[PDB]
Design a protein around this motif. Structure first.
Motif, PDB file in Angstrom:
ATOM      1  N   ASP A 214      20.008  86.544 -38.374  1.00  0.00           N
ATOM      2  CA  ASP A 214      21.283  87.136 -37.992  1.00  0.00           C
ATOM      3  C   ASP A 214      22.261  86.092 -37.434  1.00  0.00           C
ATOM      4  N   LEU A 215      21.765  84.922 -37.040  1.00  0.00           N
ATOM      5  CA  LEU A 215      22.619  83.908 -36.369  1.00  0.00           C
ATOM      6  C   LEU A 215      23.386  82.994 -37.307  1.00  0.00           C
TER       7      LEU A 215
ATOM      8  N   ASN B  48      12.899  83.071 -38.895  1.00  0.00           N
ATOM      9  CA  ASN B  48      13.479  84.063 -38.002  1.00  0.00           C
ATOM     10  C   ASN B  48      14.852  83.675 -37.469  1.00  0.00           C
TER      11      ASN B  48
ATOM     12  N   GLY C 181      10.892  83.162 -31.627  1.00  0.00           N
ATOM     13  CA  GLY C 181      10.967  84.622 -31.708  1.00  0.00           C
ATOM     14  C   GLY C 181       9.671  85.306 -32.026  1.00  0.00           C
ATOM     15  N   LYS C 182       8.546  84.656 -31.739  1.00  0.00           N
ATOM     16  CA  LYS C 182       7.236  85.228 -32.029  1.00  0.00           C
ATOM     17  C   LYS C 182       7.056  86.559 -31.260  1.00  0.00           C
ATOM     18  N   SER C 183       7.374  86.539 -29.974  1.00  0.00           N
ATOM     19  CA  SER C 183       7.196  87.710 -29.168  1.00  0.00           C
ATOM     20  C   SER C 183       8.172  88.800 -29.547  1.00  0.00           C
TER      21      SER C 183
ATOM     22  N   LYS D 148      16.247  90.760 -34.049  1.00  0.00           N
ATOM     23  CA  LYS D 148      17.380  91.528 -33.518  1.00  0.00           C
ATOM     24  C   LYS D 148      17.853  92.625 -34.451  1.00  0.00           C
TER      25      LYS D 148
ATOM     26  N   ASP E 202       8.044  76.958 -29.488  1.00  0.00           N
ATOM     27  CA  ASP E 202       8.520  77.810 -28.418  1.00  0.00           C
ATOM     28  C   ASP E 202       9.966  78.260 -28.684  1.00  0.00           C
ATOM     29  N   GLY E 203      10.184  79.509 -28.425  1.00  0.00           N
ATOM     30  CA  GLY E 203      11.532  80.093 -28.537  1.00  0.00           C
ATOM     31  C   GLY E 203      11.920  80.605 -29.907  1.00  0.00           C
TER      32      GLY E 203
ATOM     33  N   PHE F  75      14.267  95.362 -29.176  1.00  0.00           N
ATOM     34  CA  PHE F  75      14.631  93.921 -29.179  1.00  0.00           C
ATOM     35  C   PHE F  75      14.717  93.356 -27.781  1.00  0.00           C
ATOM     36  N   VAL F  76      13.898  92.348 -27.501  1.00  0.00           N
ATOM     37  CA  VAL F  76      13.911  91.684 -26.224  1.00  0.00           C
ATOM     38  C   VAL F  76      14.923  90.531 -26.271  1.00  0.00           C
ATOM     39  N   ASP F  77      15.970  90.652 -25.460  1.00  0.00           N
ATOM     40  CA  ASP F  77      16.984  89.588 -25.291  1.00  0.00           C
ATOM     41  C   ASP F  77      16.597  88.425 -24.369  1.00  0.00           C
TER      42      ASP F  77
ATOM     43  N   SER G 162      14.871  88.819 -38.840  1.00  0.00           N
ATOM     44  CA  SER G 162      15.552  88.826 -37.589  1.00  0.00           C
ATOM     45  C   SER G 162      14.941  89.853 -36.689  1.00  0.00           C
TER      46      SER G 162
ATOM     47  N   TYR H 249      14.337  85.559 -22.543  1.00  0.00           N
ATOM     48  CA  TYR H 249      13.330  84.620 -22.968  1.00  0.00           C
ATOM     49  C   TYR H 249      12.237  84.552 -21.847  1.00  0.00           C
TER      50      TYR H 249
HETATM   51  N1  LIG Z   1      19.693  86.454 -32.323  1.00  0.00           N
HETATM   52  C1  LIG Z   1      18.339  86.455 -32.322  1.00  0.00           C
HETATM   53  N2  LIG Z   1      17.670  86.072 -31.199  1.00  0.00           N
HETATM   54  C2  LIG Z   1      16.327  86.056 -31.213  1.00  0.00           C
HETATM   55  C3  LIG Z   1      15.591  86.512 -32.399  1.00  0.00           C
HETATM   56  N3  LIG Z   1      14.293  86.394 -32.131  1.00  0.00           N
HETATM   57  C4  LIG Z   1      14.185  85.957 -30.831  1.00  0.00           C
HETATM   58  N4  LIG Z   1      15.410  85.764 -30.293  1.00  0.00           N
HETATM   59  C5  LIG Z   1      15.736  85.299 -28.946  1.00  0.00           C
HETATM   60  O1  LIG Z   1      15.116  84.039 -28.745  1.00  0.00           O
HETATM   61  C6  LIG Z   1      14.578  83.996 -27.446  1.00  0.00           C
HETATM   62  C7  LIG Z   1      13.082  83.680 -27.475  1.00  0.00           C
HETATM   63  O2  LIG Z   1      12.347  84.691 -28.173  1.00  0.00           O
HETATM   64  P1  LIG Z   1      10.798  84.892 -27.887  1.00  0.00           P
HETATM   65  O3  LIG Z   1      10.429  86.020 -28.820  1.00  0.00           O
HETATM   66  O4  LIG Z   1      10.425  84.859 -26.439  1.00  0.00           O
HETATM   67  O5  LIG Z   1      10.348  83.499 -28.504  1.00  0.00           O
HETATM   68  P2  LIG Z   1       8.819  83.051 -28.518  1.00  0.00           P
HETATM   69  O6  LIG Z   1       8.563  82.425 -29.807  1.00  0.00           O
HETATM   70  O7  LIG Z   1       7.816  84.241 -28.275  1.00  0.00           O
HETATM   71  N5  LIG Z   1       8.769  81.930 -27.256  1.00  0.00           N
HETATM   72  P3  LIG Z   1       7.293  81.355 -26.605  1.00  0.00           P
HETATM   73  O8  LIG Z   1       6.652  80.437 -27.673  1.00  0.00           O
HETATM   74  O9  LIG Z   1       7.628  80.634 -25.196  1.00  0.00           O
HETATM   75  O10 LIG Z   1       6.463  82.481 -26.235  1.00  0.00           O
HETATM   76  C8  LIG Z   1      14.907  85.307 -26.776  1.00  0.00           C
HETATM   77  O11 LIG Z   1      16.095  85.100 -26.012  1.00  0.00           O
HETATM   78  C9  LIG Z   1      15.181  86.243 -27.915  1.00  0.00           C
HETATM   79  O12 LIG Z   1      16.079  87.278 -27.590  1.00  0.00           O
HETATM   80  C10 LIG Z   1      16.384  86.878 -33.569  1.00  0.00           C
HETATM   81  O13 LIG Z   1      15.852  87.227 -34.633  1.00  0.00           O
HETATM   82  N6  LIG Z   1      17.731  86.825 -33.446  1.00  0.00           N
END
Ligand SMILES: Nc1nc2c(ncn2[C@@H]2O[C@H](COP(=O)(O)OP(=O)(O)NP(=O)(O)O)[C@@H](O)[C@H]2O)c(=O)[nH]1
Ligand SMILES: [Mg+2]
Length: 168
Positions: A119-120, A116, A18-20, A147, A15-16, A31-33, A145, A35
């Motif tokens: 960029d961080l 993923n 960045g799959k979505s 982002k 979880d978290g 880019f979705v910021d 990334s 979560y």
């Molecule tokens: N800086 C940065 N932030 C990222 C990147 N990918 C995702 N995030 C951030 O990480 C958070 C979670 O991303 P999200 O795509 O929801 O993760 P997920 O894997 O789909 N989570 P889940 O398993 O609950 O569905 C968000 O705040 C998003 O902006 C990235 O490549 N760079």
């Protein structure tokens, strides 16, 4: 060849990671910021990969699985995603891979390892360490990334190429 090829891709990982965000960047260049935890979502896009026009069906998963095993077994190939600043998500990859092998009942499933959030700053997982794990699975490794868009297309496209190798 009046038939358009469709590839069923599944995106898995902790979880978290960045799959979505990866998937939404691919489809809508956005880019979705925020979560927003996923349960199960699907997407579709027509693309050209190495000259072949095809349809991607992409299943974005959650990071209690009778239902999960079923929708996983639909997948032809898998993006196994971790975040390069989250050691635990990297350690989880082995378990996603085993889950895939179990549900597909196969030792040879098309797969790509995606690191993923590159960029961080302050990565905890080194490139070499991920490269080596991918090597031990016999699969590609790509740093991405959501982002910046680094590696986004390449991750999905590379997975299609692995599916084509598999089909021969
Ligand atoms: N800086 C940065 N932030 C990222 C990147 N990918 C995702 N995030 C951030 O990480 C958070 C979670 O991303 P999200 O795509 O929801 O993760 P997920 O894997 O789909 N989570 P889940 O398993 O609950 O569905 C968000 O705040 C998003 O902006 C990235 O490549 N760079
Ligand atoms: Mg998600």
């Amino acid at each position: 060849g009046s038939h358009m090829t469709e590839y069923k891709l599944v995106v898995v990982g902790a979880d978290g990671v960045g799959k979505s965000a990866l998937t939404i960047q691919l489809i809508q260049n956005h880019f979705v910021d925020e979560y927003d935890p996923t349960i199960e979502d699907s997407y579709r896009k027509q693309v050209v990969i190495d000259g072949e026009t095809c349809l991607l069906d992409i299943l974005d998963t959650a990071g209690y699985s009778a239902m999960r095993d079923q929708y996983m077994r639909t997948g032809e190939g898998f993006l196994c995603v971790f975040a390069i600043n989250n050691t635990k998500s990297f350690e989880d990859i082995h378990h996603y891979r085993e889950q895939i092998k179990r549900v597909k009942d196969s030792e040879d499933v098309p797969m790509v390892l995606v690191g993923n959030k590159c960029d961080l700053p302050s990565r905890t997982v080194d490139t070499k360490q991920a490269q080596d794990l991918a090597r031990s699975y016999g699969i590609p490794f790509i740093e991405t990334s959501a982002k910046t868009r680094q590696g986004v297309d390449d991750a999905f496209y590379t997975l299609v190429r692995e599916i084509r190798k598999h089909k021969e």
